């Protein structure tokens, strides 16, 4: 009670590198989808990736 821990929107801390890592995964998914459409990989390879 004396310290009175609480919980706000600001306290929910995402790690600083999430935007970096999500962008890289989006770039790799975009490249493989195009080459899957080209016929350079098959469906299971795209599904696994």
């Amino acid at each position: 009670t004396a310290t009175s821990i609480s919980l706000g929107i600001d306290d929910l801390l995402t790690i600083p590198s999430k935007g970096w890592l999500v962008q890289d995964a989006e770039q790799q998914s975009l490249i493989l989808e195009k080459h899957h459409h080209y016929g350079n990989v098959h469906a299971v390879e795209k599904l696994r990736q």
């Binding site: 350079n40 990989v41 098959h42």
Partner: protein, 38 residues
Amino acid sequence: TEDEARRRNWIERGWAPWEEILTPEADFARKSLNEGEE
């Protein structure tokens, strides 16, 4: 058998082994997937 089936395909269904000009990526996919997964 796989000598009369091909002839039947050619005669009745218009089959012909037209050349598929592939990119290096598609050529690699065809030549490398014949060996295994990884």
